[PDB]
Amino acid sequence: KTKPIWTRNPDDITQEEYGEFYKSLTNDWEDHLAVKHFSVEGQLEFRALLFIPRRAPFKNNIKLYVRRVFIMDSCDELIPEYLNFIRGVVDSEDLPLNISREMLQQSKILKVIRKNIVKKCLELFSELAEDKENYKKFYEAFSKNLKLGIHEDSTNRRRLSELLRYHTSQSGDEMTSLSEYVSRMKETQKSIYYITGESKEQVANSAFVERVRKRGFEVVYMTEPIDEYCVQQLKEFDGKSLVSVTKEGLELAEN
């Protein structure tokens, strides 16, 4: 207590102490969905305590500390926009206070901080995915954000695409991954078929889904507004092109 929670060793911090700090950090009434606490050491030293909330609030999201002194809530350079739902604190032992007339140095340090935060967020999302029930709660609130991230983050494009989940003609009430779709693909199958621009009612009423389903191809059901934007940026998954079932120039032959 005398020492700030983010400086303590994760192993002897309880979930409830995390939750309480999360609740004062963010002013909400529910504890966090999930938490990731880490340090980077060696030639640069900082600690970061990061939280995924349970809701989409639906910008001023990571508090920056230098040597345990709060500086600002609006250090933009710390995290990409698609992860603006992440709440937390970062405490850097190396940044200035700040009028040491050195600015190249800050940018570089803030770059390394940012890459680590991104790395660690994706790490958490992957571990969340090992646990279906809570991954469902995360995905339901922030799936849109992973999708915006395919545009914004070239480097992590592939991993964000693995975290995506969809209803399909095969999966029924449960969701499935693009990687799961790929394993169910026919030997000769070349493309990942989907339909966007349609609510649950409109997709199930579509003749275009039926024409493709008829031939035995799995069809991905993308029924969120952002889905057309997402597929337009992803283009492919594991070398397999994404193809709209509503395209007139569709060719379905196995021959």
Side-chain angles (χ1 to χ4, degrees), residues 2 4-58 61-98 100 102-131 134-136 138-187 189 191-200 202-204 206-253 255:
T2 51
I5 195 155
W6 64 89
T7 73
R8 285 133 64 177
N9 190 318
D11 279 324
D12 51 70
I13 287 170
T14 77
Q15 283 295 313
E16 286 84 350
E17 291 166 330
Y18 279 135
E20 280 301 337
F21 178 87
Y22 168 84
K23 273 144 71 171
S24 49
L25 177 65
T26 68
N27 274 317
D28 75 330
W29 92 271
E30 297 196 282
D31 66 10
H32 63 279
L33 196 59
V35 57
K36 181 57 92 170
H37 192 174
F38 66 101
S39 61
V40 167
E41 286 180 277
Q43 297 297 282
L44 207 59
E45 194 188 354
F46 68 90
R47 301 184 75 78
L49 186 36
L50 309 164
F51 298 100
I52 303 181
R54 293 169 181 276
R55 310 299 200 256
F58 211 55
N61 63 292
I62 310 274
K63 282 177 163 172
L64 171 75
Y65 284 64
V66 166
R67 295 180 287 283
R68 317 199 189 168
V69 174
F70 174 66
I71 299 300
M72 73 184 106
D73 196 19
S74 46
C75 186
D76 273 298
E77 297 102 72
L78 279 175
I79 204 181
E81 197 86 22
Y82 79 97
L83 293 172
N84 61 13
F85 63 94
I86 298 307
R87 302 294 229 114
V89 312
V90 176
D91 195 347
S92 161
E93 270 68 73
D94 308 293
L95 280 195
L97 279 166
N98 83 44
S100 305
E102 284 178 329
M103 225 181 86
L104 165 78
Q105 289 94 322
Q106 308 187 118
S107 291
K108 291 176 155 195
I109 288 156
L110 289 163
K111 272 163 193 187
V112 175
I113 276 153
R114 176 186 182 119
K115 79 176 199 202
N116 283 277
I117 292 183
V118 176
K119 169 211 260 188
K120 225 68 190 177
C121 286
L122 306 172
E123 189 189 290
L124 179 59
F125 301 170
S126 306
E127 299 158 354
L128 214 50
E130 280 137 57
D131 171 34
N134 276 290
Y135 192 68
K136 170 168 172 191
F138 164 71
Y139 197 74
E140 191 172 312
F142 304 112
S143 54
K144 196 178 188 202
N145 291 87
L146 301 173
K147 277 159 184 177
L148 301 189
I150 284 132
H151 170 61
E152 182 171 27
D153 198 319
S154 311
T155 313
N156 298 311
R157 181 169 285 130
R158 189 203 71 117
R159 182 54 62 164
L160 292 152
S161 81
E162 290 160 348
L163 301 174
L164 291 183
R165 297 281 181 281
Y166 299 100
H167 295 121
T168 77
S169 44
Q170 186 272 344
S171 72
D173 290 334
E174 195 41 68
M175 293 217 189
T176 191
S177 75
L178 292 164
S179 191
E180 276 159 344
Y181 187 97
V182 167
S183 54
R184 294 185 296 266
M185 278 172 98
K186 302 158 144 199
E187 183 63 2
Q189 196 176 349
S191 301
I192 297 165
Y193 301 92
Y194 71 90
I195 176 150
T196 57
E198 324 222 334
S199 63
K200 287 184 189 168
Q202 170 74 337
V203 49
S206 174
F208 294 92
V209 168
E210 167 164 273
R211 67 171 297 113
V212 176
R213 193 173 185 170
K214 186 150 68 63
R215 271 95 185 175
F217 293 119
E218 196 182 341
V219 189
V220 180
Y221 297 152
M222 312 193 163
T223 69
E224 303 302 314
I226 200 67
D227 282 317
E228 178 64 26
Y229 173 90
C230 175
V231 75
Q232 217 51 248
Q233 306 306 138
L234 187 41
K235 302 179 138 65
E236 53 151 284
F237 180 74
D238 207 358
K240 322 286 192 218
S241 162
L242 272 322
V243 186
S244 171
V245 286
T246 57
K247 182 171 176 40
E248 296 285 322
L250 196 40
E251 174 50 37
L252 305 163
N255 309 340

